[PDB]
Each structure stands twice: as structure tokens, then as C-alpha cells.
Design a protein around this ligand. Structure first.
Ligand code: CL
Length: 586
């Protein structure tokens, strides 16, 4: 950071003040500034045509707002609060895009079932009234001191009511509303989320939106007021004057820097016209929340922080918003290596959560235990959500392991009859200074798999420096794929014959032929499982919900394969290999 401090100093052309030291230590942290990934992110094919990240057109009438976020570091320190607060943060993120958060999909990676993590997510999810539609849960001792908590949230928003994630013109104002601001953010880095407040924050924000009051928005998370306001105006090439004496407080004797940087939970930034502001506060008050007009959007691209008439801070806004950028490494993929089988156990999400009185996937077209969460929006309209990763492969080869994870997310989406629309991604990695090439290999694999598949990146998250005594975690890119599907066309499991369709090993040049085979068979109403292990206990237990028994002879499969299980009355006719292996009956 001494390097960064020297950059800051050159840019300001003087010693930074106490407040600038605090402000930049947040904004230029890897968590906020993305110094090691920004360049890699610029090389990702992204969803242009969408005027905000995370929001993807579905049928011209509805979009889906979705994003995945990590909460690894808090969760290692306090599993329960870390996980619960993780859920609360990603809900606010989706909300800010203008969507009623309506679906949660968890991606958990741990040495063990950490009760506090499963319970923190369950309890919070139960209290906010937002359903868990699925979970990917992987168990490996390689994760013992660094559990990964990735949470994906989604919701539907009218195309005629999208919320911008920027300020738009000088003279707009910014309202901060929701929970009051305390001294929040080792145990000092843990915050206590409360779902009851966030539940009121959802209703109040959606009410504001409906009235036409929200002209832009951003959730408060890391960095608090500073992050939200600097970024709103930085994205619109504007400035802000922030009046800290106006933030509603929970502890009155806070110093201005403490108000600026507090990471108190359940807060929202709303950009509006100054004449709409008293109605916004009217609504927040009605919903038992705290609110005030806090910043003025200005034309000069300066970030000026006030406490009453006291200048707290003034810097160029684009200095805060653009952390120093670390050079990329050019990564060159060699041949696909042979993979070993590495011990990663899968846990049934529905089984694990059921113990904390928490349902998974109840309002879905088909159970997510079969591989993808399918949601009904209208009679002939819906979407799908898939969360997938292959850290067991990325361990051995980071590029190919990562690329396959993406390709397999496509298989899963096609398997329910859905067409891939977009990816949200969570990069979970160790130390990029120690190991630059691993990060490079991940980012390039994401870049090339998006290219190979035609599926763009909509949103994402990077969590770096996941280590214990310098031992890095397995490089884990969590892929969350959005797909489009007619729920009327989704196959349910039926008494049928089972076939292994494809090849027991992997060659990139035949993946698209498998996809074409899945598509064809899906169009004809076949039920299709696509899983690394081919068939799992989760599959078996899910079939029992339908009163069905599987008796199969599974083909021997490599750690990376190009096979799926197709359930149909008669033999699949496809330009891919087909072997009859058993039955599904009763
Ligand atoms: Cl710094």
C-alpha cells in the first residue's frame, strides 16, 4: 500500500489528510478499487445495450436484475453474522436496480457444514420473505480456514421502470435512507444485519420507485456513504457535495470521518430531483426508517465533503473512483491436461437447509435438485438460474478448470430447455501478487468461454487474498448463469429409459455438438441431467419426491467429461454417441 500511498501523494501533489487516508484506504482497497482485476474485467465481453450492469432483457417487457457477491472474509471471522449480512447486502444490490428481490441461490464452499453459515443464511432469508430457489454446496478440506460464501440474488423489473445506477445531471440530490448510521466496519469488521429493517427498506424503495421518485440508486455496503455517493456521481462524470451533518445517526458523538465510512447495514442511496425529496422521506418515515437529503450532485467533478460549514475533504472524484491499475499477464492456454479426481463432496442444499426450517426451490417449475432453478414469471414466460464451479479442476489447471465450469453451466441451462442469456460471476482467488498467473488464467478462461459460448458477462464480483498463512484457496470462479425458458416446455421426470449421451472425456471441439444434441432432445420433451458425477444422491433423493426409482449402470467417466443423462421413452437420435444404461420407474 506504500506504493499506492506514493501514487495518491503524487496525484494530490501533497501529503494526504487524516480523512483522505481513511477514504482512500477504503476506495483503493482491492475490495472496492479492483486494482488487480480492472484490466482483466475490461477484456470481458459484457452486456452492452443494457444501460446498467446486472439487468438483462428477458422478453422486451421484463428484465431480470441479478448479481452474485462474496462475503468470504466476514464469514471466516464470524460465520453466522458474515453469512446473514452477505445475504442482506446482495438483496439491497438487486433492489437498487429497481427489482423486487425474489430469488436467492447460494454457492457455499467449506471444509465442513459450518452450521453458522447455513443458519445465518436460513434465518435471514426466512425473516426477509425472499425465497431460496437453490444452492450449490461443496465440501473440501482445502477450504478449512477460508470458507467461501457467494450469494446470488435475482428479481424481475419492468423495462419501463428500470433504475439507473448513476446520477444524471447537476442539481439532482442524493437521499440516504434506511437504518441509522452507527460505528460499524477484527470483530470490528463484522456487522449485524437485520432482516426486519431490510424488509421495510424493500417496501419503501419499491413504493418510491412506483411513484416516480427514484432517478438513480445504489445500496450502501463497503465504504458506506463515501462509496455510494462518490460512485453514483463518478459513473455520471459529475461531482458531489456531501453534507455529513445530515446523515441520520444511531450514535450522536461520531466524528465526520466515521460518518463517511461507517458500514452500518440496511441503507440505500437514492438520486432524485430536490422537489421529490420530501415525499421520499415521507415514505421512508411511514416505513419506520430514517432518511435525509445528504448530497448535492454538481457539474464540477469534485468530491467535496462537509460537516456543517467545516470542510471535511475535497478531492477529484475520479481519483477516488479509479484505483491504481496493476498490469495484466498475457495468458497462453496450452493443451487440455489430463485431470486427477480430487475429493470434493456435494451436499444436498434442500436437506441441509430443512434443518433450519428453511425451504429451497418450493415455487419453481421443476426441483433445483435436478440442476437449475426454473422460475415462472408468466404462463409462457420464465427464467433459469444456475450456479456452478469446478475448483477441483481449476486446482490442477486454472484455465481449463475455469473454462469447463462455464461450459458446464451452459449444459445445465440447455438441459432444462433454457437459452443462456448472461453470466454473473464471482472470482474467488488467493494472493495475486504472489501468484499473478493464476488470476490471469481465470480471467482469460472467463473471457474465452464467454467468447466460445456467445454468452456475455452482465455483472460480477472479485474476492481476492483468500489465504491462510500464505496458502491460497483453490481458484474458484463461481458462474451464475441466467437463462430464458417457457415453463410450459419444461420436462418433469416420468417413467422412462435412461441413456448416457455424449463422451466420457473432454475435447473442446465437440462441446458444441453436445449442446446441439441437448437442445434437440430438450425440444422433444426429454428429461436431462447434466452433472460432473453423472448421477448423484441429490438426483436420487429428488426422484423419490416423484415416487420414482432409478436402476442404472453408469459409464466410467473422466473428471472432465462430455456426457449427460437423458430420460425418454425411446432412444435419442443425435449426432453424438448414445448408450442405454437403465430405467426410471414407478
Ligand atoms: Cl492508500
Amino acid at each position: 500500500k506504500l506504493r499506492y500511498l506514493n501514487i495518491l501523494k503524487e496525484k494530490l501533489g501533497r501529503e494526504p489528510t487524516f480523512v483522505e487516508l481513511q477514504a482512500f484506504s477504503v476506495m483503493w482497497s482491492e475490495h472496492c478499487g479492483y486494482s488487480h482485476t480492472k484490466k482483466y474485467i475490461r477484456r470481458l465481453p459484457k452486456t452492452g445495450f443494457e444501460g446498467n450492469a446486472g439487468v438483462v432483457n428477458l422478453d422486451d417487457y421484463y428484465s431480470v436484475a441479478f448479481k452474485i457477491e462474496s462475503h468470504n472474509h466476514p464469514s471466516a471471522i464470524e460465520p453466522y453474522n458474515g453469512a446473514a449480512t452477505g445475504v442482506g447486502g446482495i438483496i439491497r444490490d438487486v433492489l437498487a436496480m429497481g427489482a423486487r428481490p425474489t430469488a436467492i441461490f447460494d454457492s457455499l464452499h467449506m471444509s465442513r457444514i459450518i452450521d453458522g453459515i447455513i443458519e445465518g443464511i436460513a434465518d435471514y432469508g426466512n425473516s426477509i420473505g425472499v425465497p431460496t430457489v437453490g444452492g450449490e454446496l461443496r465440501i473440501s478440506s482445502l477450504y478449512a480456514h477460508n470458507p467461501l460464501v457467494n450469494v446470488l440474488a435475482a428479481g424481475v423489473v419492468r423495462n419501463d421502470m428500470l433504475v439507473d445506477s448513476k446520477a444524471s445531471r447537476p442539481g439532482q440530490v442524493i437521499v440516504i435512507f434506511g437504518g441509522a448510521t452507527g460505528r460499524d466496519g477484527t470483530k470490528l469488521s463484522i456487522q449485524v444485519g437485520d432482516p426486519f429493517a431490510e424488509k421495510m427498506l424493500i417496501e419503501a424503495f419499491l413504493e418510491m420507485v412506483e411513484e416516480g421518485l427514484v432517478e438513480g440508486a445504489q445500496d450502501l455496503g463497503a465504504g458506506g456513504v463515501l462509496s455510494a455517493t462518490s460512485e453514483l456521481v463518478a459513473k455520471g462524470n459529475l461531482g458531489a457535495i456531501v453534507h455529513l451533518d445530515r446523515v441520520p445517526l444511531r450514535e450522536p458523538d461520531m466524528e465526520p470521518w466515521e460518518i463517511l465510512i461507517s458500514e452500518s447495514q440496511e441503507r440505500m442511496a437514492v438520486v432524485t430531483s430536490p422537489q421529490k425529496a420530501s415525499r421520499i422521506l415521507e415514505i421512508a418515515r411511514k416505513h419506520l426508517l430514517f432518511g435525509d437529503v445528504v448530497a448535492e450532485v454538481i457539474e464540477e467533478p469534485v468530491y467535496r465533503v462537509m460537516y456543517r460549514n467545516d470542510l471535511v475533504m475535497e478531492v477529484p472524484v475520479q481519483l477516488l473512483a479509479n484505483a491504481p491499475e496493476e498490469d495484466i499477464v498475457e495468458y497462453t492456454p496450452g493443451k487440455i491436461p489430463e485431470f486427477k479426481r480430487v475429493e470434493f463432496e456435494e451436499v444436498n442444499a434442500r436437506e441441509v437447509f430443512e434443518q433450519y426450517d428453511h425451504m429451497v426451490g418450493t415455487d419453481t417449475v421443476v426441483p433445483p435438485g435436478f440442476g437449475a432453478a426454473v422460475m415462472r414469471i408468466k404462463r409462457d414466460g420464465g427464467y433459469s438460474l444456475v450456479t456452478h464451479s469446478r475448483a477441483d479442476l481449476a486446482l490442477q489447471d486454472t484455465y481449463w478448470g475455469t473454462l469447463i465450469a462455464v461450459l458446464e453451466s451452459v449444459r445445465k441451462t440447455l438441459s432444462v430447455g433454457a437459452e443462456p442469456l448472461a453470466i454473473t460471476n464471482c472470482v474467488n482467488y488467493g494472493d495475486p501478487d504472489v501468484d499473478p498467473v493464476g488470476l490471469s488464467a481465470m480471467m482469460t478462461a472467463l473471457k474465452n468461454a464467454c467468447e466460445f459460448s456467445g454468452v456475455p458477462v452482465a455483472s460480477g464480483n472479485a474476492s481476492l487474498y483468500n489465504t491462510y498463512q500464505g496458502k491460497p484457496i483453490p481458484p474458484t470462479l463461481v458462474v451464475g448463469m441466467l437463462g430464458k425458458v417457457n415453463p410450459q416446455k419444461v420436462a418433469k421426470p416420468k417413467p422412462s429409459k435412461v441413456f448416457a449421451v455424449g463422451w466420457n472425456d473432454f475435447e473442446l471441439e465437440r462441446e458444441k455438438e453436445l449442446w446441439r444434441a441437448i437442445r434437440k432432445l430438450s425440444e422433444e420433451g426429454a428429461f436431462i441431467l447434466s452433472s460432473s458425477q453423472l448421477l448423484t444422491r441429490t438426483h436420487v433423493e429428488t426422484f423419490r419426491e416423484y415416487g420414482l426409482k432409478i436402476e442404472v449402470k453408469l459409464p466410467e467417466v473422466r473428471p472432465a467429461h462430455q456426457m449427460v443423462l437423458v430420460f425418454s421413452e425411446r432412444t435419442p437420435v443425435v449426432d453424438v454417441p448414445v448408450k442405454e444404461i437403465g430405467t426410471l420407474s414407478r
